[PDB]
Write an enzyme that holds these catalytic residues in place. Structure first.
Site, PDB file in Angstrom:
ATOM      1  N   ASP A   1       0.844  -1.076  -0.041  1.00  0.00           N
ATOM      2  CA  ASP A   1      -0.141   0.113  -0.130  1.00  0.00           C
ATOM      3  C   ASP A   1       0.829   1.193   0.137  1.00  0.00           C
ATOM      4  O   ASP A   1       0.385   2.184   0.713  1.00  0.00           O
ATOM      5  CB  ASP A   1      -0.669   0.133   1.223  1.00  0.00           C
ATOM      6  CG  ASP A   1      -1.754  -0.996   1.309  1.00  0.00           C
ATOM      7  OD1 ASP A   1      -2.621  -1.093   0.376  1.00  0.00           O
ATOM      8  OD2 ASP A   1      -1.721  -1.494   2.593  1.00  0.00           O
TER       9      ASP A   1
ATOM     10  N   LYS B   1       2.270   4.652  -0.564  1.00  0.00           N
ATOM     11  CA  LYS B   1       1.924   6.012  -1.058  1.00  0.00           C
ATOM     12  C   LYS B   1       2.418   7.036  -0.247  1.00  0.00           C
ATOM     13  O   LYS B   1       2.893   6.884   0.712  1.00  0.00           O
ATOM     14  CB  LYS B   1       0.181   5.884  -0.773  1.00  0.00           C
ATOM     15  CG  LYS B   1      -0.398   5.838   0.276  1.00  0.00           C
ATOM     16  CD  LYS B   1      -1.863   5.200   0.210  1.00  0.00           C
ATOM     17  CE  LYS B   1      -2.643   5.146   1.726  1.00  0.00           C
ATOM     18  NZ  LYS B   1      -1.826   3.916   2.305  1.00  0.00           N
TER      19      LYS B   1
ATOM     20  N   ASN C   1       2.318   7.533   3.646  1.00  0.00           N
ATOM     21  CA  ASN C   1       3.341   6.376   4.432  1.00  0.00           C
ATOM     22  C   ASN C   1       4.711   7.050   4.210  1.00  0.00           C
ATOM     23  O   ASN C   1       5.619   6.228   4.778  1.00  0.00           O
ATOM     24  CB  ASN C   1       2.948   5.204   3.583  1.00  0.00           C
ATOM     25  CG  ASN C   1       2.026   4.377   4.215  1.00  0.00           C
ATOM     26  OD1 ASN C   1       1.172   4.495   5.165  1.00  0.00           O
ATOM     27  ND2 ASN C   1       1.304   3.868   3.235  1.00  0.00           N
TER      28      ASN C   1
ATOM     29  N   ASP D   1       4.267   1.628   8.006  1.00  0.00           N
ATOM     30  CA  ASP D   1       3.201   0.733   7.704  1.00  0.00           C
ATOM     31  C   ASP D   1       3.905  -0.782   6.990  1.00  0.00           C
ATOM     32  O   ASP D   1       3.159  -1.330   6.664  1.00  0.00           O
ATOM     33  CB  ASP D   1       1.932   1.304   7.128  1.00  0.00           C
ATOM     34  CG  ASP D   1       1.061   1.930   8.148  1.00  0.00           C
ATOM     35  OD1 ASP D   1       1.403   1.872   9.501  1.00  0.00           O
ATOM     36  OD2 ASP D   1       0.139   2.553   7.612  1.00  0.00           O
TER      37      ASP D   1
ATOM     38  N   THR E   1      -6.270   6.019  -1.857  1.00  0.00           N
ATOM     39  CA  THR E   1      -5.272   4.703  -2.264  1.00  0.00           C
ATOM     40  C   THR E   1      -5.430   4.087  -3.748  1.00  0.00           C
ATOM     41  O   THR E   1      -4.287   3.588  -4.176  1.00  0.00           O
ATOM     42  CB  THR E   1      -6.076   3.435  -1.561  1.00  0.00           C
ATOM     43  OG1 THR E   1      -7.157   3.274  -1.815  1.00  0.00           O
ATOM     44  CG2 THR E   1      -5.979   3.481   0.010  1.00  0.00           C
TER      45      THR E   1
HETATM   46  N1  LIG Z   1       5.533   6.534  13.925  1.00  0.00           N
HETATM   47  C1  LIG Z   1       4.757   7.751  14.094  1.00  0.00           C
HETATM   48  O1  LIG Z   1       5.583   8.821  14.279  1.00  0.00           O
HETATM   49  C2  LIG Z   1       3.711   7.873  13.626  1.00  0.00           C
HETATM   50  C3  LIG Z   1       2.804   7.087  12.898  1.00  0.00           C
HETATM   51  C4  LIG Z   1       2.757   5.708  12.861  1.00  0.00           C
HETATM   52  C5  LIG Z   1       2.530   5.040  11.836  1.00  0.00           C
HETATM   53  N2  LIG Z   1       2.526   3.713  11.657  1.00  0.00           N
HETATM   54  C6  LIG Z   1       3.094   2.943  12.360  1.00  0.00           C
HETATM   55  C7  LIG Z   1       3.102   1.560  12.340  1.00  0.00           C
HETATM   56  C8  LIG Z   1       3.306   0.704  13.382  1.00  0.00           C
HETATM   57  O2  LIG Z   1       3.393  -0.507  13.323  1.00  0.00           O
HETATM   58  C9  LIG Z   1       3.476  -1.181  12.359  1.00  0.00           C
HETATM   59  C10 LIG Z   1       4.702  -1.029  11.324  1.00  0.00           C
HETATM   60  C11 LIG Z   1       5.257  -2.695  11.257  1.00  0.00           C
HETATM   61  C12 LIG Z   1       3.982  -2.762  12.414  1.00  0.00           C
HETATM   62  C13 LIG Z   1       3.697   1.242  14.510  1.00  0.00           C
HETATM   63  C14 LIG Z   1       3.915   2.856  14.750  1.00  0.00           C
HETATM   64  C15 LIG Z   1       3.156   3.459  13.725  1.00  0.00           C
HETATM   65  C16 LIG Z   1       3.265   4.778  14.092  1.00  0.00           C
HETATM   66  N3  LIG Z   1       1.742   7.546  12.641  1.00  0.00           N
HETATM   67  N4  LIG Z   1       1.897   9.020  12.671  1.00  0.00           N
HETATM   68  C17 LIG Z   1       1.099  10.015  12.361  1.00  0.00           C
HETATM   69  C18 LIG Z   1      -0.240   9.591  12.385  1.00  0.00           C
HETATM   70  C19 LIG Z   1      -1.247  10.646  12.125  1.00  0.00           C
HETATM   71  C20 LIG Z   1      -1.036  10.995  10.532  1.00  0.00           C
HETATM   72  C21 LIG Z   1       0.565  11.536  10.710  1.00  0.00           C
HETATM   73  C22 LIG Z   1       1.496  10.381  11.003  1.00  0.00           C
HETATM   74  C23 LIG Z   1       3.057   9.228  13.266  1.00  0.00           C
HETATM   75  N5  LIG Z   1       3.526  10.362  13.457  1.00  0.00           N
END
Ligand SMILES: NC(=O)c1c(-c2cnc3cc(OC4CCC4)ccc3c2)nn(C2CCCCC2)c1N
Length: 464
Positions: A131, A133, A136, A152, A171
């Site tokens: 996915d 994009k 991400n 992700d 998407t």
């Molecule tokens: N890591 C961060 O800083 C994040 C995340 C985020 C995104 N995907 C994740 C995915 C995660 O786990 C999966 C990755 C392999 C399992 C764990 C934490 C995550 C955190 N979203 N976001 C925001 C969420 C609202 C929209 C902007 C990004 C962050 N700031």
């Protein structure tokens, strides 16, 4: 066996991502900050067995790459999975790009090589994104030279995607045709990156259409062209790489690793030739428009969702307090408000923010601090229900207003009927249905709406 809230407290919500809410969390002992994705088992199906997912998690925790979100911990309880990873503070890539005075093939080539480098790593570990994009692609900090961290990687293989348009909006532009038909491998991630490359250098998606199905149809056919003007300022070398990443049959499509070796990448990231290279002013203008549009359709869908959640939660909460009030008095006291508010969460869930009993007590206290007197007093439940629910929404009601302000770039105060047609097309709202709603709010209008009229339209589109 270990439990998430014994180790982390929630500090605030970062937002809403694929598969769940992401909360800024803090280890209660070390003070280490982390971003925690919270996947509700009720809202998301699992594609694999427990065993297969635990294995994939274990692997992910041991992988390390500068362009890939670092994962640290994983927890599971009755209702939820908690994925714990590193906090990034630079926000979505495209949101930083629209803020930019100048963009060139060099800026694009540095970005693309970050993305490809992260992918090639993941592919050597047999992990496909699927996915990929722009959402991400997070930047690591608010610096100007920030690294890109892909979020992700690995989730699509284990969790079944939302069919809700609020969640799948954006998407279709990036999905590889083979994903559509069911037989896909790692090469799908090259395609998606190829699409993101095209958009970066033109500001228009290569496969485009009025609504999601029309997009998917262009995608499955796999034709696009480089005939738009802004493709005049772009090197043959870029268009060649795009061509090979957008090659229909996967086995003929270039790998991530070979893309990294392509001439365009070699040349444009060598960090010598940069002073001589034109800025792509048309492309950056087109991206600003593309992005504004996407964020507005997204805010419209969330706002409609939040009004529906609010309606649902207001009646439920009111029923819990009525059934609590043997006084029949309509008066209610603090420990009970908390007890009922908890009983709400019990059945609703929905709240990554309320991850423990203490989160709830504090939200009750904040409501009472906006309300009148005697936090500790015997309270009239109906008035508390109003304020508690407004608090929950207006973040939507605020984000909606903000995204409409941003979309209205010329500050006219208005969005034309043609702009609506685009906005609703991307939100997958039937044309006749919104035109119909447009006519009932302002029965005299002349093909444009102000913010209050646009908001009334969305209210009517969610049964109000
Ligand atoms: N890591 C961060 O800083 C994040 C995340 C985020 C995104 N995907 C994740 C995915 C995660 O786990 C999966 C990755 C392999 C399992 C764990 C934490 C995550 C955190 N979203 N976001 C925001 C969420 C609202 C929209 C902007 C990004 C962050 N700031």
């Amino acid at each position: 066996t270990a439990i998430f809230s014994d180790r982390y407290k929630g500090q605030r919500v970062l937002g809403k991502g694929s598969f769940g809410e992401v909360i800024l969390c803090k280890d209660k002992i070390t003070g280490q900050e982390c971003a925690v994705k919270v996947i509700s088992k009720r809202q998301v199906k699992q594609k694999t067995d427990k065993e297969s997912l635990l294995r994939e998690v274990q692997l992910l925790k041991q992988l390390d790459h500068p362009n890939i979100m670092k994962l640290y911990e994983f927890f599971e309880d009755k209702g939820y999975f908690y994925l714990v990873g590193e906090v990034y503070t630079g926000g979505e890539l495209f949101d930083e790009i629209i803020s930019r005075k100048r963009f060139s093939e060099v800026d694009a080539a540095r970005i693309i090589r970050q993305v490809l480098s992260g992918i090639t790593y993941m592919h050597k570990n047999k992990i496909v994104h699927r996915d990929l994009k722009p959402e991400n692609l997070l930047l690591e900090s608010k610096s100007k030279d920030a690294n890109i961290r892909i979020i992700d990687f690995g989730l699509s293989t284990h969790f079944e995607a939302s069919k809700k348009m609020k969640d799948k909006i954006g998407t279709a532009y990036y999905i590889a045709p083979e994903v559509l038909h069911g037989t896909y491998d790692e090469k799908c991630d090259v395609w998606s990156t190829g699409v993101i490359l095209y958009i970066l250098l033109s500001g228009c998606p290569p496969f485009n259409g009025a609504n999601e199905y029309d997009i998917l149809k262009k995608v499955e056919k796999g034709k696009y062209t480089f005939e738009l003007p802004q493709w005049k300022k772009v090197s043959e070398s870029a268009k060649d790489l795009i061509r090979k990443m957008l090659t229909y049959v996967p086995s003929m499509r270039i790998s991530a690793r070979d893309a990294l070796d392509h001439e365009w990448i070699q040349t444009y990231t060598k960090e010598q030739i940069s002073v001589d290279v034109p800025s792509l002013d048309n492309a950056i203008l087109n991206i600003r428009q593309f992005q504004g549009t996407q964020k507005l359709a997204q805010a419209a869908l969330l706002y409609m969702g939040s009004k529906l959640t609010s309606q649902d939660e207001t009646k439920e909460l009111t029923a819990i307090f009525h059934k609590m009030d043997k006084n029949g008095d309509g008066q209610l006291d603090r420990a009970e408000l908390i007890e009922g508010y908890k009983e709400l969460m019990r059945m609703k869930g929905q709240d990554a923010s309320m991850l423990d009993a203490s989160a709830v007590e504090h939200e009750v206290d904040q409501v009472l601090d906006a309300v009148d007197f005697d936090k500790n007093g015997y309270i009239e439940y109906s008035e508390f229900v109003t304020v508690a629910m407004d608090r929950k929404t207006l973040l939507s009601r605020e984000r909606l207003e903000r995204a409409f302000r941003m979309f209205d770039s010329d500050n006219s105060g208005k969005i034309s009927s043609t702009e609506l047609a685009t906005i609703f097309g991307v939100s997958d709202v039937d044309s006749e249905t919104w035109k119909s709603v447009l006519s009932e709010v302002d029965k005299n209008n002349d093909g444009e709406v102000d913010f209050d009229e646009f908001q009334q339209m969305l209210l009517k589109l969610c049964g109000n």
